[PDB]
Design an enzyme around this catalytic site. Structure first.
Site, PDB file in Angstrom:
ATOM      1  N   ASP A 163      25.078 -42.126  13.056  1.00 38.06           N
ATOM      2  CA  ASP A 163      25.808 -41.162  13.948  1.00 38.06           C
ATOM      3  C   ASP A 163      26.671 -41.715  15.198  1.00 38.06           C
ATOM      4  O   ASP A 163      26.306 -42.923  15.314  1.00 38.06           O
ATOM      5  CB  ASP A 163      24.557 -40.262  14.673  1.00 38.06           C
ATOM      6  CG  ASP A 163      25.006 -39.079  15.406  1.00 38.06           C
ATOM      7  OD1 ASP A 163      25.801 -39.227  16.482  1.00 38.06           O
ATOM      8  OD2 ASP A 163      24.730 -37.980  14.797  1.00 38.06           O
ATOM      9  N   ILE A 166      29.444 -39.829  22.224  1.00 33.26           N
ATOM     10  CA  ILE A 166      29.772 -40.563  23.533  1.00 33.26           C
ATOM     11  C   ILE A 166      28.684 -40.110  24.430  1.00 33.26           C
ATOM     12  O   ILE A 166      28.079 -39.169  24.652  1.00 33.26           O
ATOM     13  CB  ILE A 166      31.211 -39.565  24.038  1.00 33.26           C
ATOM     14  CG1 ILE A 166      32.321 -39.975  23.158  1.00 33.26           C
ATOM     15  CG2 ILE A 166      31.298 -40.134  25.390  1.00 33.26           C
ATOM     16  CD1 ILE A 166      33.289 -38.955  23.438  1.00 33.26           C
ATOM     17  N   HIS A 167      28.005 -41.408  25.182  1.00 42.80           N
ATOM     18  CA  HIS A 167      27.337 -41.345  26.326  1.00 42.80           C
ATOM     19  C   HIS A 167      27.784 -41.998  27.357  1.00 42.80           C
ATOM     20  O   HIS A 167      28.493 -43.122  27.216  1.00 42.80           O
ATOM     21  CB  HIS A 167      26.032 -42.015  25.661  1.00 42.80           C
ATOM     22  CG  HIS A 167      25.371 -41.239  24.599  1.00 42.80           C
ATOM     23  ND1 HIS A 167      24.162 -40.337  24.778  1.00 42.80           N
ATOM     24  CD2 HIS A 167      25.478 -41.300  23.197  1.00 42.80           C
ATOM     25  CE1 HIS A 167      23.762 -39.785  23.442  1.00 42.80           C
ATOM     26  NE2 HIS A 167      24.524 -40.353  22.701  1.00 42.80           N
ATOM     27  N   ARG A 168      27.283 -41.710  28.558  1.00 48.87           N
ATOM     28  CA  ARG A 168      27.756 -42.545  29.903  1.00 48.87           C
ATOM     29  C   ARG A 168      26.979 -43.641  29.964  1.00 48.87           C
ATOM     30  O   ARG A 168      25.662 -43.906  29.766  1.00 48.87           O
ATOM     31  CB  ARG A 168      27.600 -41.446  30.927  1.00 48.87           C
ATOM     32  CG  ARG A 168      26.058 -41.368  31.726  1.00 48.87           C
ATOM     33  CD  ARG A 168      26.117 -40.953  32.964  1.00 48.87           C
ATOM     34  NE  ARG A 168      24.885 -40.594  33.394  1.00 48.87           N
ATOM     35  CZ  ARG A 168      24.161 -39.509  33.560  1.00 48.87           C
ATOM     36  NH1 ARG A 168      24.498 -38.534  32.728  1.00 48.87           N
ATOM     37  NH2 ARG A 168      22.991 -39.549  33.889  1.00 48.87           N
ATOM     38  N   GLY A 184      17.153 -34.452  22.140  1.00 47.31           N
ATOM     39  CA  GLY A 184      17.549 -33.874  20.980  1.00 47.31           C
ATOM     40  C   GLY A 184      18.639 -34.517  20.612  1.00 47.31           C
ATOM     41  O   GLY A 184      19.345 -34.163  19.510  1.00 47.31           O
ATOM     42  N   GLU A 230      29.864 -38.030  12.227  1.00 43.28           N
ATOM     43  CA  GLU A 230      31.060 -37.422  12.665  1.00 43.28           C
ATOM     44  C   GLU A 230      32.428 -37.950  12.498  1.00 43.28           C
ATOM     45  O   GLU A 230      33.333 -37.505  12.468  1.00 43.28           O
ATOM     46  CB  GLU A 230      30.776 -37.013  14.121  1.00 43.28           C
ATOM     47  CG  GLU A 230      29.664 -36.128  14.553  1.00 43.28           C
ATOM     48  CD  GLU A 230      28.498 -37.197  14.846  1.00 43.28           C
ATOM     49  OE1 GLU A 230      28.527 -38.185  14.483  1.00 43.28           O
ATOM     50  OE2 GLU A 230      27.624 -36.608  15.713  1.00 43.28           O
ATOM     51  N   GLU A 286      29.976 -34.410  36.597  1.00 44.07           N
ATOM     52  CA  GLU A 286      29.701 -33.859  35.362  1.00 44.07           C
ATOM     53  C   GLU A 286      30.743 -32.796  35.147  1.00 44.07           C
ATOM     54  O   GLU A 286      31.209 -32.340  36.131  1.00 44.07           O
ATOM     55  CB  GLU A 286      28.116 -33.409  35.341  1.00 44.07           C
ATOM     56  CG  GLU A 286      27.079 -34.123  35.618  1.00 44.07           C
ATOM     57  CD  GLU A 286      25.674 -33.533  36.051  1.00 44.07           C
ATOM     58  OE1 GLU A 286      25.833 -32.488  36.531  1.00 44.07           O
ATOM     59  OE2 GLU A 286      24.812 -34.465  35.887  1.00 44.07           O
TER      60      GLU A 286
HETATM   61  C1  LIG Z   1      32.451 -35.751  25.851  1.00 45.29           C
HETATM   62  C2  LIG Z   1      31.312 -36.286  26.661  1.00 45.29           C
HETATM   63  C3  LIG Z   1      30.159 -35.954  25.988  1.00 45.29           C
HETATM   64  C4  LIG Z   1      29.186 -36.361  26.735  1.00 45.29           C
HETATM   65  C5  LIG Z   1      29.196 -37.210  27.678  1.00 45.29           C
HETATM   66  C6  LIG Z   1      30.375 -37.494  28.236  1.00 45.29           C
HETATM   67  C7  LIG Z   1      31.536 -37.113  27.586  1.00 45.29           C
HETATM   68  C8  LIG Z   1      33.029 -37.179  27.982  1.00 45.29           C
HETATM   69  C9  LIG Z   1      30.453 -38.331  29.353  1.00 45.29           C
HETATM   70  C10 LIG Z   1      30.604 -39.808  29.226  1.00 45.29           C
HETATM   71  C11 LIG Z   1      31.590 -38.043  30.462  1.00 45.29           C
HETATM   72  C12 LIG Z   1      29.161 -38.328  30.409  1.00 45.29           C
HETATM   73  C13 LIG Z   1      28.048 -37.747  29.337  1.00 45.29           C
HETATM   74  N1  LIG Z   1      28.023 -37.645  28.318  1.00 45.29           N
HETATM   75  C14 LIG Z   1      26.807 -37.552  27.513  1.00 45.29           C
HETATM   76  C15 LIG Z   1      26.805 -36.887  26.582  1.00 45.29           C
HETATM   77  N2  LIG Z   1      25.323 -36.826  26.036  1.00 45.29           N
HETATM   78  C16 LIG Z   1      24.398 -37.345  26.323  1.00 45.29           C
HETATM   79  O1  LIG Z   1      23.627 -37.166  25.848  1.00 45.29           O
HETATM   80  N3  LIG Z   1      24.752 -38.133  27.241  1.00 45.29           N
HETATM   81  C17 LIG Z   1      25.572 -38.158  27.692  1.00 45.29           C
HETATM   82  O2  LIG Z   1      25.819 -38.996  29.000  1.00 45.29           O
HETATM   83  N4  LIG Z   1      27.816 -35.921  26.147  1.00 45.29           N
HETATM   84  C18 LIG Z   1      27.744 -35.063  25.180  1.00 45.29           C
HETATM   85  C19 LIG Z   1      27.908 -35.490  23.777  1.00 45.29           C
HETATM   86  O3  LIG Z   1      28.699 -36.184  23.892  1.00 45.29           O
HETATM   87  C20 LIG Z   1      27.808 -34.384  22.682  1.00 45.29           C
HETATM   88  O4  LIG Z   1      27.037 -33.435  23.136  1.00 45.29           O
HETATM   89  C21 LIG Z   1      27.716 -34.743  21.369  1.00 45.29           C
HETATM   90  O5  LIG Z   1      28.246 -33.779  20.594  1.00 45.29           O
HETATM   91  C22 LIG Z   1      26.135 -34.800  21.030  1.00 45.29           C
HETATM   92  O6  LIG Z   1      26.155 -35.353  19.729  1.00 45.29           O
HETATM   93  P1  LIG Z   1      25.023 -35.738  18.829  1.00 45.29           P
HETATM   94  O7  LIG Z   1      24.418 -34.281  18.111  1.00 45.29           O
HETATM   95  O8  LIG Z   1      25.295 -36.457  17.556  1.00 45.29           O
HETATM   96  O9  LIG Z   1      24.024 -36.414  19.848  1.00 45.29           O
HETATM   97 MN   LIG Z   2      25.321 -36.081  15.630  1.00 46.25          MN
HETATM   98 NA    NA Z   3      27.065 -37.724  17.662  1.00 44.25          NA
END
Ligand SMILES: Cc1cc2c3c(c1C)C(C)(C)CC=[N+]3c1c([nH]c(=O)[nH]c1=O)N2C[C@H](O)[C@H](O)[C@H](O)COP(=O)(O)O
Ligand SMILES: [Mn+2]
Ligand code: NA
Ligand SMILES: Cc1cc2c3c(c1C)C(C)(C)CC=[N+]3c1c([nH]c(=O)[nH]c1=O)N2C[C@H](O)[C@H](O)[C@H](O)COP(=O)(O)O
Ligand SMILES: [Mn+2]
Ligand code: NA
Lengths: 488, 488
Positions: A163, A166-168, A184, A230, A286
């Site tokens: 998988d 994007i995570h911060r 989740g 993805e 956010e």
């Molecule tokens: C676009 C984007 C999506 C973030 C995101 C950010 C962006 C720019 C940031 C970098 C600005 C800050 C927060 N982000 C996080 C995040 N999800 C999460 O769990 N923690 C995060 O910190 N997300 C949401 C996550 O990327 C989406 O919900 C995915 O579709 C989750 O995919 P998954 O089902 O495979 O886990």
């Molecule tokens: Mn996924």
């Molecule tokens: Na993902």
């Protein structure tokens, strides 16, 4: 043919107005985001702001030789160019790609520009905070952040299940980043499994990518269920498999043509407070436009190596503003469009994950009632949208003669095609999203806990029986170009 | 090993209570349905009624040697016996079937018991009305009906795409039947292509089948979209491709192990009034429990041959009552369960397409709140159900300690686990189903046309924060057998 960030930049330079550079020194701490707030942040960012060019800062104070790019996805028009279709048809174009993914392939290091430089973390002089600029958004951020860190991870029981999300990531030490994983999340499933075994989880953080990869990654279940890699979406968008490469120090693959790669491991048992070094009490802005609070307990990534191209670009975002609207909103539209088209073929004309909801909270559905039986289906399409994307909050339904990407035209439909005691349906007590601060028991007695909402459907479609009375004034079809060539 | 209807009956006889026969003469006109109404029609049939045994009338007045079977599917326990699972897990057992279909397989005519007797319609004395006793349900029916006629047709431009659907068939002449197709029916797409080219569409009507075939055929979009051979859901239930035979008189295939086959063609340009010989104004009873009106313009099947086993059983239904509940309800349940499990894994425990709604109008969802964030997801499950099955009208949500197949326990949850001004959400103006007579502007000013409804969600789940106060009174777990052995 785009297959990485720099082929994407080359395309933007052939469309002036979409990419600029600057050599005036900028501080990655707060100052950079402050500049781009006025230039291209857009979205829910505090006014004044606008959409503009993607912007490259060539002179980064404290990091000679580094260059930072922001705003690559901060424009729906820019996104459509990078994907190669018209902006009005993004929902259909991205929708078909997620239904027909193309699986990534592994290539040797010789075809992985991301590995032109290798920096091992076990060098005594290695320091993540000196090696890469990690810009902050506000002066009150938890610390230096990487905001376009596409994390790649696999299941420890089955390495074929990969998988990408994007995570911060906050830079905490010379070799540690904190990572926030919402409950989740699919990678969190992998992480909880590894930690339950007392074992680390190998991850790669891939930064500076083909825009198709970032966009394609931001799908959620049920559209991309657990197990759906993805990266297949990006592969379909380019009709070319994403190329993966073996990391240099961790047992996980990395995106071969990325600009910067951080290889690391999610440590078991270790937790850290996100703002331990600043005590600001905040994380970063956010997507709804408010500042998030620091997370008191986050897993940490122990950095094993960093791996870069020559003169590598560090790509991140500001706002997150319009960049988040594009990254989350295009999959949101694609997910909704696919669901409605499967259930009600031919009915839904278009969908806009409005930038006012950061691409998540507000859905504009454009329908066309073709026959008397289509009356009553506009509300069904809203239900399908709400059932497909549970983080939606409100739905606005409009007919095919309303420009759903023109917020003026949306408010027009809400003014002349809506009666408040007829057209508004409220659904109390539906789980929504934690980051909407109005989703709180303090805002409404029908809300039992944080992140639960009343969800509202505004039906601004003309009732079928009245359609002949709601025709918009017809102006003669002309080509205006000969009367003002300069403006076309 | 159940491969057809006789092997299915053989199993029912090993479970006393599920199958009975009678030698007392019965009139297939009205009287047969009148008797089974009291014995096992069930469902929405006007009381007195019950579920009971499947019933075989061996002496049919005017048809010596014929024998009529009704009620084969008129019980959820019996359907579970015939499919080999427990009734509470039919939603899951059928749910996994539709998502793993097994395509059917063609067989030579020497292995086709259906063709043991052949009556060609070009015989001067051939008369469908004297050849098979098509029973009527009410004295005011449009005429004699076949109600378990599984019609098998294909796309006239793509032979590869075949669809099978149960349609009510009214015997109109010695070699003609009328057939009603609702708007957007999948076979209607084939007939309209045939009629638009001025060509007849060859069809086969297959009656007296393995219960697995009838049940698997009753799915709808988006679960089984256009182009999905519903044959193979049966193939998945039996882990066995159903066997096909090439028609003896039409360019179409028939189910080899069926009891009775009617081969014919849908004629281009021809239409008949369904009650042309009766002028009752009614077709037959519909699944909500009311009399359908006679369709004024129906396509015609010209019979070319009738083909049947030795001592062929004519299988049909009465009510349509509980038999329709099973045939329509288990696809309904499977569709909802698949959709909620994709969107919220682990949350939905079970779903019941309640017999009070004929298996279509009323959905009972059994959820389990496992954590604080599950509060607010019960409404999300209701939205998913309404988005997945647009002909639903109402949803009742209950917890895992409520028996969703016990209507007393459902009313119990609606009495002690609901407040009228809190737990009830109404969604006006959503398209539902034409055959609900309350879906009419004469019933409500929010209804703009027939078949549009207010849809209502009754949340009878305990609020997460209050769950410790709503534990059902626990009794000591004992084995009651020694104190009442005969009661098992
Ligand atoms: C676009 C984007 C999506 C973030 C995101 C950010 C962006 C720019 C940031 C970098 C600005 C800050 C927060 N982000 C996080 C995040 N999800 C999460 O769990 N923690 C995060 O910190 N997300 C949401 C996550 O990327 C989406 O919900 C995915 O579709 C989750 O995919 P998954 O089902 O495979 O886990
Ligand atoms: Mn996924
Ligand atoms: Na993902
Ligand atoms: C179970 C069942 C379904 C009937 C039905 C009956 C039963 C017992 C009868 C025979 C008792 C009375 C009416 N029937 C009709 C009907 N659909 C239709 O278009 N015309 C009908 O006459 N249906 C509904 C239809 O069969 C289902 O909705 C199918 O799922 C439609 O399949 P499809 O999408 O492939 O067209
Ligand atoms: Mn079908
Ligand atoms: Na069908």
């Amino acid at each position: 043919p785009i297959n990485d960030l720099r082929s994407a930049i080359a395309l933007l330079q052939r469309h002036p107005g979409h990419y600029i550079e600057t050599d005036h020194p900028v501080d990655p701490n707060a100052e950079l985001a402050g500049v781009y707030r006025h230039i291209g942040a857009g979205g829910t960012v505090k006014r004044p702001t606008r959409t503009g060019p993607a912007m490259m800062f060539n002179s980064v104070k404290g990091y000679p030789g580094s260059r930072i790019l922001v705003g690559m996805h901060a424009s729906r028009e820019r996104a459509a160019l990078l994907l190669g279709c018209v902006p009005s048809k993004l929902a259909q174009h991205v929708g078909q790609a997620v239904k027909n993914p193309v699986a990534p392939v592994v290539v040797p290091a010789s075809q992985a520009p991301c590995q032109e430089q290798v920096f091992y973390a076990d060098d005594p002089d290695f320091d993540l905070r000196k090696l890469l600029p990690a810009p902050t958004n506000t002066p009150i951020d938890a610390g230096p952040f990487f905001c376009l860190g596409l994390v790649l991870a696999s299941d420890p029981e089955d390495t074929s299940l990969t998988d990408v999300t994007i995570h911060r990531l906050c830079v905490q030490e010379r070799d540690e980043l904190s990572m926030f994983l919402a409950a989740g999340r699919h990678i969190e499933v992998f992480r909880k499994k590894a930690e339950a075994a007392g074992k680390p989880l190998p991850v790669t953080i891939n930064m500076g990518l083909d825009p198709a990869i970032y966009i394609g990654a931001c799908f959620e279940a049920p559209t991309t269920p657990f197990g759906y890699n993805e990266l297949g979406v990006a592969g379909a968008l380019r009709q070319q498999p994403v190329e993966l490469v073996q990391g240099v120090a961790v047992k996980e693959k990395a995106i071969a043509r990325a600009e910067i790669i951080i290889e690391g491991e999610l440590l078991p048992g270790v937790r850290v407070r996100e703002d331990q070094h600043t005590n600001t009490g905040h994380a970063m802005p956010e997507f709804p436009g408010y500042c998030g609070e620091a997370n008191p307990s986050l897993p940490v990534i122990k950095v094993k190596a960093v791996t870069m191209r020559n003169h590598a670009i560090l790509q991140t975002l500001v706002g997150p503003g319009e960049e988040h609207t594009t990254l989350a909103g295009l999959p949101t539209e694609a997910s909704i469009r696919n669901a409605v088209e499967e259930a009600i073929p031919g009915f839904l004309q278009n969908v806009y994950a409005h930038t006012a909801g950061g691409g998540k909270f507000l859905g504009i559905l454009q329908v066309k009632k073709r026959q008397p039986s289509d009356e009553g289906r506009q509300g069904q399409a809203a239900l399908i949208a709400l059932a497909t994307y549970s983080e939606l909050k409100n739905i606005i339904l409009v007919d095919e003669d309303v420009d759903i990407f023109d917020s003026d035209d949306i408010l027009w439909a809400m003014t002349t095609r809506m009666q408040g005691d007829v057209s508004i349906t409220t659904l109390p007590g539906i789980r929504g999203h934690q980051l909407d601060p109005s989703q709180s028991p303090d805002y409404s007695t029908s809300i039992r806990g944080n992140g639960i909402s009343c969800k509202t459907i505004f039906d601004c479609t003309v009732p079928w029986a009245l359609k002949a009375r709601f025709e918009r004034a017809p102006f003669m079809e002309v080509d205006p170009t000969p009367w003002a060539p300069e403006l076309f």
